[PDB]
Amino acid sequence: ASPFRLASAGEISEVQGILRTAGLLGPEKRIAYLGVLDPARGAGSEAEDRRFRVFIHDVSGARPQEVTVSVTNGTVISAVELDTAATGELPVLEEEFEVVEQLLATDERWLKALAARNLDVSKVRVAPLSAGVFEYAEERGRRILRGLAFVQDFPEDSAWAHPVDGLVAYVDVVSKEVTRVIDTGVFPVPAEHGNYTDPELTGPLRTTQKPISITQPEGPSFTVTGGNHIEWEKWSLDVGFDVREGVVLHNIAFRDGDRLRPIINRASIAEMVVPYGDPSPIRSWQNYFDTGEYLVGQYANSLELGCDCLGDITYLSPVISDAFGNPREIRNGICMHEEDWGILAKHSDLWSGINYTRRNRRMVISFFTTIGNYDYGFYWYLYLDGTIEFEAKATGVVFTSAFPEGGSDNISQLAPGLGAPFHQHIFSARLDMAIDGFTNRVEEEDVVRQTMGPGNERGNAFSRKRTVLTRESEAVREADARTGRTWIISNPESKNRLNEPVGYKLHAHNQPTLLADPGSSIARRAAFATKDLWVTRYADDERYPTGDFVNQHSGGAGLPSYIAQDRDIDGQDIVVWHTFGLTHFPRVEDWPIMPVDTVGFKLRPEGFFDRSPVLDVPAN
Amino acid sequence: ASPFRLASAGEISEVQGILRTAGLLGPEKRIAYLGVLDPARGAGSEAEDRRFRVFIHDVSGARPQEVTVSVTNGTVISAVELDTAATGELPVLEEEFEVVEQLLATDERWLKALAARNLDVSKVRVAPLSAGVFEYAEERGRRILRGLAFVQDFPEDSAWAHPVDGLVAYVDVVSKEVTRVIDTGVFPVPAEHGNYTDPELTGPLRTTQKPISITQPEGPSFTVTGGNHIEWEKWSLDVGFDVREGVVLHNIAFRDGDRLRPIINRASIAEMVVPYGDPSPIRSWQNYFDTGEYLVGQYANSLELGCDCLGDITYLSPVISDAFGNPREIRNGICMHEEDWGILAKHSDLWSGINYTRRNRRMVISFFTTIGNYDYGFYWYLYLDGTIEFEAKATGVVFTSAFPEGGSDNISQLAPGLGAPFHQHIFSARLDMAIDGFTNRVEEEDVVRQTMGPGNERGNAFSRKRTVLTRESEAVREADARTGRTWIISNPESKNRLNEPVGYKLHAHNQPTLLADPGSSIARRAAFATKDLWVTRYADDERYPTGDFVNQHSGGAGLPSYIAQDRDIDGQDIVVWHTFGLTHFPRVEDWPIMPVDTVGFKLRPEGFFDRSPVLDVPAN
Ligand SMILES: [Cu+2]
Ligand SMILES: [Cu+2]
C-alpha cells in the first residue's frame, strides 16, 4: 500500500493502544491533535514506517506532551513535556467549548451582567473564542478562552442576530474558573430575527427553477486506487487529510508522454487567520486562526449529493481521532468529480478552411468546514492544459455586534441596531515545489515599459524583466499589479526543446495583505500575512507559517524565524508560501446568510511542455 | 413589438430599397457599416421609429457617406459626405481583403522579393492588416492596407507557422495600386509545421475521456419572447446585436419583489485594441482595432451544439447586411443557456441544529468571433445573487514572426526559428448606467490603514474611504490593488431600508493598462487604454472610446475630447467606461493552437437590496 494513504480506523486504534500501554494515555489525558507524518525526504527505503504525531493534553493541569508513535513497529518513538508558557497552548478541544457556557451560568458577576440587561440566562449562548496574547499577565501558562454572548429566543433561533455587546468573559478551562467579566456598558440587543428558513422572512419560495441534470452515463474519467490515489487526464496525485490542514495534496504529477513529471510534492493551506478591524475592547482581541487554533479538518461537514456536490461524485471518508483516541469517521467529507469548463481552444482558419474546437475540463477535490458562524469551502482544480488552481469559498453567517447610534468607521450596519465588524480572511498556501524534481528556483517577473527614442522605437515596445531570488532574506516578496508581477518557479537543470528552463508561473489575485498596524499583536503572530510571497529552504519541522502551537502564543516563531537562517534557494529543495485573502466590509446582502465570495490563485505552465499539451484531446 | 428587437432581414431589405430609390446605392457604392440606432433618451413616445445608421463607401474614389434611414417612414433622414482625410476612413470591407494578395501577385518588386527567398507566389498568403497612422504623407485621404506574407505549403496548411519576415507591402485598395514594398532583409522561413489536426503532430488521440452529459429534462428556466427579450430568475434584459460591437445588452433589470429595478441601460464592449510590442519596422505599425476597424460582429462564427456550447442551448441568429445591402444571417451566432455554479450559501449551526445549503446558477450569453489568426469569445454572466460579469476568452493562433538568432527582448520563441511578438489585448466596456434609474454617481473606495495609538487602538483597526467623482475632468481613474480600490455606482435618490444609497460595486482584475510610450501613435489613437476607468455624461453621439471612424484616423477624437467638456456627473445620466486587458508574453504552450486565457470584470450589489436577495431560492 502507499505511504501517503489515508490513516485508517485500525491505525488510530493502534495509536491509542500504544499510548495506553506506554502509560501516556491515562484517564486524565486528552488527545488535542493526531495525524500521520509525511514520509522522510530520503524515502528511497522500503521502510513503510507509518508514524503519527500526537499532542496530549492533561485535564488535571499537568504539563502536556508531544508524542511521535510508530504504528508499524508498535512503539513510542519520542515523548516530550511541553512548556506551554514558552511555546504556546495546544489546540482548543471540542469538550472545552461547552465548559465556558456552563461555568458562566453560575458565576455571579455574569448573572448580574445579564440581569442588568433583563436577559434570561437559559437563553444566553456563549461563543467560545480563542484568547490571543494581550495585556493579561495572569493568562500566561494557563488555558484561557474568551466568551461573547448571543441571545437565542428559541431552540431553532439564529443567535447571531442577537449579539450582547459590551460584555466579555475570560475563562480558565482547566481549573474551571472565571478569571474576569468585563462590562463596558449596556447596548440594546438587536430584536430582528435572522432566520433564513422561516417562511415569513423568505416569503414564498420561487417555483421558476427547472432542474439541471449533470450525469456521466459511462462513469467518471478518473480512477481511484489505494483509497486515495487519483489518475485523471494525464494528472496523477494523492489526496491526503489532516485534522489541522484539511485536504492535503501529495505528489501532483503530469504524464508528459511516457514520462511522469512531478510538479508539486505537497500542497496545502497551512494557516488561515481572520483578524477583526473593530477597535472596541469587546472584540479588538478577536482573530481566528481557524487552522492553528481550532483545526479545520476536525470540523469538516459530511457533504450531501445534489446539494453540496452535484454530478457524478466519488466520496472519501477521512478518519480522525477523538479526544480519547477512538476513531471517528467524517462520512462523505471529501467530494471528488470532474466537470466541463467550456472552450479549451478554437480557431476557424480562412486560408486552410479548417474549423477547430476543443472543450476544457477540470477535476474538483473539495471539502467544507464550519467553525462557529463561519463556513469555508476549500477547492483544488486541475485543468487539461496543466493549470492548477485553488479557490476558497467563504460563506456562513457574518460575525455580529451592535451598530452604535452615532455610527462607526470599523463596522457595517446590516439591519436596525445590528452591526458587522470589518475583517479579513487571510490564507497561507504552502507549496512544497517539485518542478520536474527538487532542484527549483523562484523568479520574479515584472513588465517593463520602454521610452520612445533611438533604441528601436516608435514608442510601441515593451518588455519583461526576471530577477532570481537566491537567498531566503531576499525572498520576502510583495505583489505589484501595476507591473503585472508574477513569480515563476523553474528547474534550471531541466530544459524544454528550445533549451529554456521548464517552469510554472504563479498568478496571484493581488488582494490586500494584513491591514493591522505593523506593531500590533496580530501582526507578530500572523507575520506571514504581511507579505504576498515567502520562499524557504525545505526542512521537516518548518510546517506552519506561525509555528506548531498557535493557541495563545507570541509572534515570530513562524516564517520570520525560518527566513532568518538565510539559506540558499537558487536551485534547491524549496517551499513557496503564498499569502492571499479577502478584505470583508460586510454589506446588507451578506445578512442573514452570506452568499459565497471567493479568493485563490493559480499556477500555469511556463515553457514546461514542448508545445500545447492539449493537442491530443478529442472532439467529444 | 419591442424597439430593442433584433434587426430583421425585411428591415435590411427596406434600407437597401430606400437607399436605392434615393440614389444613394448605385452600382459603385458599398455598405461599410449598417446597424439599428438605439431609441432616444426621451422614449416616452409610442413612436416606433426604427432608424438605421449606414456608412456608404464609393468604389470609384468618390467621397463616402454617412446616412441615417427610417425603415418606419421609408425615408432617408440625413446624408452627409465624409472627408475621410479629416475624420478617418470607413471600416475595412471583406472584399478588400482579397484584393491585396491579388495586386501583389503581379507587382514586380513583390515578385522580386519572393524570388530572392525562393518562394513560389502561388504559395504566398498575404494577411490584410489595418494601416495605422504613421510617417507616410501619401496615405492621408487614401484607403491603404498593409500586407504581411505567410507561406502555405499546401491548401490545408497553417500558414501562421511560416511567416515571411523582413517584408511588408502597402496597398491602395481603391485605386488598386501598390504604393510600397519594403524589404529590410531576408530571414529564414520557419520550416516546422503547426498543424494541430495532423495525427503526426497530435499523436494518438486520448481515449480516456468519458462523456459528460448536461441536460434539462424540463427545459430551461429562462423564457424568450419577442425574439430577444430574456426573463430568468428575477433577471430581465434584451439581447441586441450590432456588426461593430457584437452582442449588446439592453435594459438589464432585476425583479425585487413586484418592483422591476433597472441596473444597466446598455452594456457592450465598445472597442478592443491589440497593440504589438515589437519595435521592428516590419510590425511596429501593428495594432488591431478589432471592433473599430474590422467590425467584430461581422466575423461571428456559427456555434455548434456540443462543441461550442454544451447543455440545453437556445440560439439567436442575428441578421447583418452585406456590402450591397442584402440580408445575411449569422446562423446560431449567439448561444444562451443557464448553468450550475456551485454553492450559493451554506451554514451548519451548532446552536439551532439547522443545516442549510443552496446552489448558485448563472445565465450565459455568448458569441465567438474570428479576425485573421485571432478568435475571441465574449461572455456575459448573470448570477442569482445579483452579480453581473463579463469574460473575454482569447484563443486562436498567435501572430508570428521570425525569432532572430541573437534573441529578442520583445519576442518569444515558440519553435526553432519561430517567434511571437509581445502584445496586449485591451478591451473597453461601455456601461451606460441606470442603478435604480438615471440619477447615478460614481464613488472610488480605497481601504485605509490606521496607526496604532490613542484613538481606539491595539493596532487592529482598519477602515475604508469613499470619494465622489463630481466632474468629468476628475473622472479619469487608475486602479490600485494595494488599497483594494473599487468603484461604486450608486443612486443618491434611492435608498435601502438602512437609509443608505443603493449601489453596485465594480471589481476590476487590475491587469496592466497600455504599455506603449505616452508619446506614441497608438497611445493617441487608443487613449482610453491608458486608464482603468473613465466616467462621462451621456450623449447620443459619444458611442465609442476612439470615435466613429477608427480606420487610419489620428488620436484624441474619442474619450479625451469627451472628458474635456467637464460635465457634471454627480447624480446624472452617466456612462462608465472600463478598460481591462491581457498582457500576452507568448509561451511554448500557446503554439500551435492557443488554449483559452481570460480577463473580465464583475459588478456586485452594494446595499442595493434590503437583505440577501437569494433567501427564496429552493433546495433542489
Ligand atoms: Cu467575512
Ligand atoms: Cu494574445
> Residue B593 and residue A345: Cβ atoms within 8 Å?
yes
Q: Which amino acid is at B321?
A: S
Ligand nearest to the CA of B398: 2
Ligand nearest to the CA of B598: 2
Q: How far is the CA of A590 from the centre of ligand 1 (A)?
A: 9
Strand segments (E) across A276-326: 287-289, 314-316, 319-321
Question: Cell digits for A102?
Answer: 456552563
Give A413's contacts in chain B (Cβ within 8 Å): 498, 500
Whether B72 and B50 have beta carbons less than 8 Å apart is answered as: yes
Whether B297 and B244 have beta carbons less than 8 Å apart is answered as: yes
Strand segments (E) across B434-558: 441-449, 462-469, 476-477, 486-495, 501-508, 533-537
Active-site pick, A276, A374, A379, A544: A374
Distance CA A401, CA A284 (A): 12
Query: Looking at residue A87, what DSSP letter applies?
Result: H
A593 → closest Cβ in B352, B356, B585: B356
B596 lies within 8 A of chain A by CB? yes
The b-or-e profile of A190-213 (16+ CB within 10 A means b, else e) is beebbbbeeeebbeeeeeebeebe
Element (H, E) at A259: strand A259-275
Give the strand order in the sheet containing A29-36: A29-36, A51-58, A65-70, A75-81
Name B168's Cβ contacts closer than 8 Å, sequence gap at least 6: B146, B147, B148, B181, B182, B281, B282
Cα–Cα distances (Å) from A262 to A227, A438, A571, B330, B491, in that order, read 21, 9, 16, 46, 53
Q: Which amino acid is at A88?
A: G
> Residue A589 and residue B613: Cβ atoms within 8 Å?
yes
Residue A367 backbone zone (phi > 0: left; psi -120 to 50: alpha; other: beta): beta
Instruction: Name the resolution in angstroms.
Output: 2.2
Distance CA B156, CA B19 (A): 41
A239 lies within 8 A of chain B by CB? no
B499 lies within 8 A of chain A by CB? no
Distance CA A559, CA B569 (A): 48
Q: How far is the CA of B374 from the centre of ligand 2 (A)?
A: 8
Question: Cell digits for A274?
Answer: 481572520
Which residues lie across from A357 on neighbouring strands?
A346
Which residues lie across from B455 on neighbouring strands?
none
C-alpha distance from A84 to closest chain B C-alpha (Å) = 24
Alpha carbons within 13 A on the beta-carbon side of B538: 20
Alpha carbons within 13 A on the beta-carbon side of B484: 23
Whether B617 and A206 have beta carbons less than 8 Å apart is answered as: yes
Chain centroid to CA B305 = 24
Distance CA B508, CA B576 (A): 13
Q: How far is the CA of B512 from the centre of ligand 2 (A)?
A: 14
B302 lies within 8 A of chain A by CB? no
Give B595's contacts in chain A (Cβ within 8 Å): 344-345, 360, 385, 612, 614
Whether B242 and B34 have beta carbons less than 8 Å apart is answered as: no
Strands B314-316 and B287-289: unpaired
Ligand nearest to the CA of B392: 2
Element (H, E) at B199: helix B199-202
Chain centroid to CA A73 = 33
Number of other CB atoms surrounding residue B176 within 10 Å: 11
Closest CA to B194 of B397, B376, B394: B397
How was this one solved?
Answer: X-ray
Mutate to test the interface with B, among A347, A358, A424, A464 (most CBs of B within 10 A): A347
Q: How far is the CA of B201 from the centre of ligand 2 (A)?
A: 23
The owner of cell 486504534 is A13
B520 lies within 8 A of chain A by CB? yes
Mutate to test the interface with A, among B208, B355, B589 (most CBs of A within 10 A): B589
DSSP helix, strand, coil percent of chain B (3-state; round to 5)? 15, 40, 45
Distance CA B255, CA B604 (A): 16
Name B389's Cβ contacts closer than 8 Å, sequence gap at least 6: B380, B381, B383, B600, B601, B602, B603
B483 → closest Cβ in A208, A280, A512: A512
Distance CA A6, CA A356 (A): 43
Closest CA to A427 of A397, A396, A391: A391
Distance CA A224, CA A241 (A): 16
Which SS3 state, helix, strand or coil, does residue B439 take?
Answer: coil
Residue in A with minimal Cα distance to B158: A352
Q: How far is the CA of B186 from the centre of ligand 2 (A)?
A: 26
Distance CA B157, CA B125 (A): 11
Ligand nearest to the CA of B272: 2
**What domains, with CATH codes, occur in chain A?**
1-87 (3.10.450.40), 94-195 (3.10.450.40), 196-619 (2.70.98.20)
DSSP helix, strand, coil percent of chain A (3-state; round to 5)? 15, 40, 45
Strands B355-371 and A411-415: unpaired
Whether B115 and B107 have beta carbons less than 8 Å apart is answered as: no
Residue in A with minimal Cα distance to B457: A279
Number of other CB atoms surrounding residue A258 within 10 Å: 5
Whether A411 and A420 have beta carbons less than 8 Å apart is answered as: yes
Q: What HEC string does B8-40 produce?
A: CHHHHHHHHHHHHHCCCCCCCEEEEEEEECCCC
Phi first, then psi, for residue A60 (nearest 5°) are -105, 15
B461 → closest Cβ in A277, A393, A511: A277
Whether A133 and A554 have beta carbons less than 8 Å apart is answered as: yes
Q: Which amino acid is at A543?
A: R
Residues making up the annotated binding site of B for substrate are 288-299, 371-376
Q: What HEC string does B247-296 produce?
A: EEEEEEEEEECCEEEEEEEEEEEEEEEEEECCCCCCCCCCEEEHHHHHCH
Mutate to test the interface with B, among A400, A460, A520, A579 (most CBs of B within 10 A): A460
Q: How far is the CA of B576 from the centre of ligand 2 (A)?
A: 26
Q: How far is the CA of B375 from the centre of ligand 2 (A)?
A: 10
Number of other CB atoms surrounding residue B324 within 10 Å: 12
Which SS3 state, helix, strand or coil, does residue B371 take?
Answer: strand
State whether the Cα torsion A554-A560-A564-A565 is positive or negative: positive
Element (H, E) at A112: helix A108-115
Catalytic residue annotation of B: 290, 374
> Residue A519 and residue B159: Cβ atoms within 8 Å?
no
CA angle A525, A528, A531 (to 5 degrees): 135
Mutate to test the interface with A, among B129, B157, B212 (most CBs of A within 10 A): B212
Give B158's contacts in chain A (Cβ within 8 Å): 349, 352
Name A225's Cβ contacts closer than 8 Å, sequence gap at least 6: A231
Cα–Cα distances (Å) from A258 to A32, A234, A261, in that order, read 45, 10, 9
Clarify whether A544 is annotated catalytic.
no
